[PDB]
Amino acid sequence: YSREKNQPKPSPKRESGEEFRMEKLNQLWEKAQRLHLPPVRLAELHADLKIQERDELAWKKLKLDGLDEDGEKEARLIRNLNVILAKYGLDGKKDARQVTSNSLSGTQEDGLDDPRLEKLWHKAKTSGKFSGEELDKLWREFLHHKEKVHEYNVLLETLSRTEEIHENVISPSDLSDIKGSVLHSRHTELKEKLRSINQGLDRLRRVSHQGYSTEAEFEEPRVIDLWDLAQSANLTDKELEAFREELKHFEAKIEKHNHYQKQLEIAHEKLRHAESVGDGERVSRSREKHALLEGRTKELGYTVKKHLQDLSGRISRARHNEL
Predict the structure, then answer these.
(1) 268: how many CB neighbours lie within 10 A of its CB?
(2) Best exposed site among 136, 174, 244, 283 by fewest CB in 10 Å?
């Protein structure tokens, strides 16, 4: 009834020892142990890891014999490592960056390859102070767009293939079939995600074209104000009169420049709209005035610069009576 059959139970020996030849591998094994997984899964997972160890030995021996050269074998092993961790989703990481660092560095120098990218990078870097710290921030979002876009495009292109299957896409359906949260939802996500991305790039354009320095770059209430003082700085009547008219014209000139700038901005908007026509009309006329207005603006700034130096020196001191 009992059927003892067998029942071995000899004294225990070596209650501990080394499992894997590597401590690192041993650590991972312990991690799986604490995780606790089904018997079948544990045996299968453990087996796979064992294969990796064996393969490692083989790779070493192959190199010893002298066969590997491209290094694809090692790359395959590395890729598998990431793949296994990726599937398990145990590829956890956190920011910390220890106090010490290799600070070694010594590889190929790279940064900008596409001329278009160099335009924005250099434009800001010089347009103001877009120092690699600020440029880096802009780059954070730049690549962010590249990665997100590739995911949407890559994923779309991925499922796009499963559409021309045996070349067949048509059925007695005005809109296939929608019952809620099916097709319409996908289209909405497409417009929402793409428009968001499109708006994102537009935002970057607006930031670089709008999110820049504001307020007058000069018109300081010090230099110009000082000239205004001139009168209160105790001057002669003749010099005061010539000065009064001189200052009046200076303030009037700057004011006029500002007016042109306003019209220049509006004119620019019209140019963009007119260009949308495609007929090429009004484009030439708008461009002509566009450059002319820009020319006067630049010319005015130049004149002010010279006037600033001339007046600065002459006003330095009304030493020669009427100067």
Answers:
(1) 14
(2) 174
From the number of C-beta atoms within 10 Å of its C-beta (0-12, 13-18, 19+), residue 142 rates as middle
Q: Which of 243, 130, 142 is nearest to 200 (CA)?
A: 142
Quick check: 100 and 185 in contact, CB under 8 A?
no
Q: Which CATH number fits domain 21-91: 3.30.365.10, 1.20.81.10, 3.40.1280.10, 2.120.10.30?
A: 1.20.81.10
Q: Amino acid letter at 191?
A: K
Rounded Cα distance, 254 and 250, in Å: 6
Assess contact for 29 and 45: CB atoms under 8 A: no
Residue 152, C-beta contacts closer than 8 angstroms, at least 6 positions apart: 193, 194, 197
Q: Does domain 216-323 have CATH number 1.20.81.10?
A: yes
- The 8-class DSSP code of residue 219 comes to -
Chain centre to alpha carbon of residue 251 = 43
Indicate the CATH number of 111-215 among 2.60.290.11, 1.20.81.10, 3.60.110.10, 3.90.249.10. Answer: 1.20.81.10
| Spatial CA neighbour of 116 closest among 195, 211, 199, 201 | 201
Inter-helix orientation angle 72-88/39-65, to 10°: 160
218 phi/psi in degrees, rounded to 5: -135, -105
Q: Is the dihedral of CA 267, 273, 274, 276 positive or negative?
A: positive
Would you say 54 and 48 are in contact if contact means Cβ atoms under 8 Å apart? no
Q: How many residues does the chain have?
A: 323
User: Residue 172 and residue 42: Cα distance in Å, rounded?
Assistant: 51
| Sign of the dihedral through C-alpha 119, 120, 125, 127 | positive
Question: For residues 270 and 286, is the Cβ–Cβ distance under 8 A?
Answer: yes
